[PDB]
């Protein structure tokens, strides 16, 4: 059918407003829900329907700034929300010590990402502190953790580190040689990329791996032409109509972005079947409340609404901005970032 | 102790044992974004959690408070961290915690925080004795749970428990030969033990796979494994494979088989074989067969592959 654009704009609007206690499990990841919504509005060119200033303040209140003595540098970045109970402070005053307050790599990523989407210039972001915190997260094998207190480590966070280093336009945030090593070691016998060495290759990790390399501008340098051809084959094989994340697994709307974006970065998305993909993504559209679901006749959510839209974007949907496949922001936003970068270089 | 849904449950703000502590409220400032509305009970538990955290109170009452915070939201990684801090401070029985987390994970098998917690505990106890069985159960309510397979590979590698995995794999491939996760597990085991250099093993495996392919010819997983373990030594270096496949074509044909053939022919062209121009035609003929009739959804891709081959070997 058709793309109920306005319906979706209303959907993201609600998301930025108030959620039912049934989404309590997203509490510590509220910032990434904000991203899905904001970047989603951006993608629909409707950022006007929100007060960019209020949101920018909220986001800045989530930054873990270094304390007076700067003894907490290894823990700076952004929080997912205010669940720790720290007094609201839009990065105005110095950091207030707290035994367990520290950033989360996915939040620093979506945080900065959100600020740029909203037009902020990142002047209030303690870039050095963030980069200091980032470095602290990388492990000996090249991958990253999400928090300094410890967590699981895998390709998801390698992509987060990459996005952060790219946006702050400074790669001192990671040991790129080790990161690239990790990404290589994750390639499977079937040629896809997994969360880590030996694991089952997966559409999500493949995107993270490929996108990270592109962000570092070393795709061609890390993988041989033969290797890239095998990876392309693995990706292109994910399309059934919509896309699944692993062989013999049911399609899921969000993979139209995860895999589609990878195919785009590999310059062969053009050879995929557009109609069947578009038809599937739409079959998961909620014509009543808006947004998209992973499967048709299933409840919608911010994640699938956003990625479903970005999936459509890849095929240049009427009424949706072109999405920057590696940075996961609209091209418009990616450019505002280019300018923002030039500015600093003075 | 006192369950969150017990008739006699009492808000922490009304409990004697918590009279001395001042609850700490959360505040998203003037204009809150993506704000979640919380019930009295929920907000209550967490307002006290924030209090205890802020004071880094390593108390026994705090340890219990976490159980409630976890029931309200097992995705709060900070809660789990603090709980681990307390597990050490209060020197709690880790074998007991293993039961706790085993129950939790069963209820939420797709939660990142809970699998991490279990991994940390197993490291602490240096005891993997119950891991393989636990994972096998979880893999029963979802044989493709990525969290489960990831944890399984960690345990097996960390405590070198390869002895029975290849057998477990054989069993699961019988329950569902299309489970890509199991095929990956198979490669994981073999390459981490005997390896594939032993021509005896390579042979056993290629044979095993061809047998599975014959049972269910349309199975990307089986084909990817086959090509996987041979692609690096050189697909063209196995003359009997090319023929055995060409023979299967009639009855067990599928896009995967045709694709494999294309890849074999390309390996040949790559290694300046006999009949360069003749081979390229056999390849192109198949690419078109894929695009026009066998794997139409990838029509534009296969044609692209064809043009690629043609402009590289002419």
């Amino acid at each position: 059918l058709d793309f109920l654009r306005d319906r979706h704009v209303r959907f993201f609007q609600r998301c930025l407003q108030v959620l039912p206690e049934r989404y309590s499990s997203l509490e510590t990841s509220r910032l990434t829900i904000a991203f899905f919504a904001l970047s989603g509005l951006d993608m629909l060119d409707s950022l006007d329907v929100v007060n960019k200033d209020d949101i920018i303040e909220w986001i800045y209140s989530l930054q873990v700034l270094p304390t007076e003595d700067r003894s907490n540098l290894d823990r700076c970045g952004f929080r997912g929300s205010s669940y720790l109970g720290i007094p609201f402070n839009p990065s105005k005053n110095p950091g207030t010590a707290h035994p367990y307050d520290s950033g989360h790599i996915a939040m620093t990523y979506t945080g900065l990402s959100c600020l740029i989407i909203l037009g902020d210039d990142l002047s209030r972001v303690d870039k050095e502190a963030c980069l200091a915190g980032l470095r602290a997260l990388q492990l000996e094998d090249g991958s990253f953790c999400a928090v300094p207190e410890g967590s699981e480590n895998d390709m998801r966070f390698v992509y987060c580190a990459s996005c952060i280093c790219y946006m702050l336009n400074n790669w001192s945030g990671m040991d790129m040689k080790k990161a690239i090593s990790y990404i290589r070691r994750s390639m499977s016998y079937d040629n896809g990329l997994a969360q880590g060495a030996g694991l089952e290759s997966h559409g999500g990790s493949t995107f993270c791996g490929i996108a990270s390399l592109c962000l570092m501008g070393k795709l061609e340098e890390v993988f041989s032409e033969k290797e890239l051809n095998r990876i392309k084959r693995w990706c292109i094989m994910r399309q059934q109509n919509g896309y699944h994340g692993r062989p013999n697994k049911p399609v899921d709307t969000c993979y139209s972005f995860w895999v589609g974006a990878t195919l785009k970065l590999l310059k062969i998305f053009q050879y995929t079947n557009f109609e069947k993909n578009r038809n599937y993504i739409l079959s998961t559209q909620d014509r009543l409340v808006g947004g998209f679901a992973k499967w048709p006749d299933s409840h919608p959510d911010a994640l699938h609404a956003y990625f479903g839209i970005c999936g459509l974007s890849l095929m240049e949907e009427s009424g949706i901005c072109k999405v920057h496949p590696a940075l996961n922001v609209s091209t418009r936003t990616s450019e505002r970032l280019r300018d923002l970068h030039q500015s600093w270089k003075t | 102790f006192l369950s969150l849904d017990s008739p006699t449950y009492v808000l922490y703000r009304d409990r004697a044992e918590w009279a001395d502590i001042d609850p700490v409220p959360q505040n998203d400032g003037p204009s809150p974004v993506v704000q979640i509305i919380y019930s009295e009970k929920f907000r209550d538990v967490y307002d006290y959690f924030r209090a205890v955290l802020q004071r880094d109170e390593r108390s026994e009452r705090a340890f219990k408070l976490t159980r409630d915070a976890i029931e309200l939201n097992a995705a709060n990684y900070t809660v789990w961290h603090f709980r681990r801090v307390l597990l050490r401070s209060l020197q709690k029985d880790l074998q007991e915690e293993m039961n706790y987390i085993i129950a939790i994970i069963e209820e939420q098998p797709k939660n990142y925080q809970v699998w991490h917690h279990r991994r940390v505990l197993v490291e602490w106890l240096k005891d993997p004795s119950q891991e393989l069985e636990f994972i096998a159960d979880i893999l029963n309510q979802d044989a493709k749970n990525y969290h489960a397979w990831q944890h399984r590979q960690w345990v097996i590698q960390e405590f070198r428990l390869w002895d029975n995995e290849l057998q477990y794999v054989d069993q699961l491939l019988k329950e569902d030969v299309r489970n890509n996760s199991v095929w990956n597990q198979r490669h994981f085991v073999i390459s981490n033990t005997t390896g594939y250099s032993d021509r005896a093993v390579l042979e056993r495996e290629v044979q095993y796979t061809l047998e599975m392919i014959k049972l269910v010819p349309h199975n990307e997983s089986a084909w990817n494994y086959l090509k996987g373990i041979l692609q690096d030594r050189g697909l063209s270096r196995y003359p009997n494979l090319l023929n055995q496949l060409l023979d299967l074509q009639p009855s067990h044909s599928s896009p995967y088989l045709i694709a494999f053939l294309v890849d074999i022919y390309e390996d040949m062209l790559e290694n300046q074989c006999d009949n360069k121009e003749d081979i390229l035609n056999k390849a192109l003929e198949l690419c078109e067969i894929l695009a026009k009739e066998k794997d139409t959804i990838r029509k534009e891709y296969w044609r692209y592959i064809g043009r690629s081959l043609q402009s590289k070997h002419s």
Partner: peptide, 5 residues
């Protein structure tokens, strides 16, 4: 649903 974190 798809849990990413």
């Amino acid at each position: 649903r798809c849990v990413l974190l």
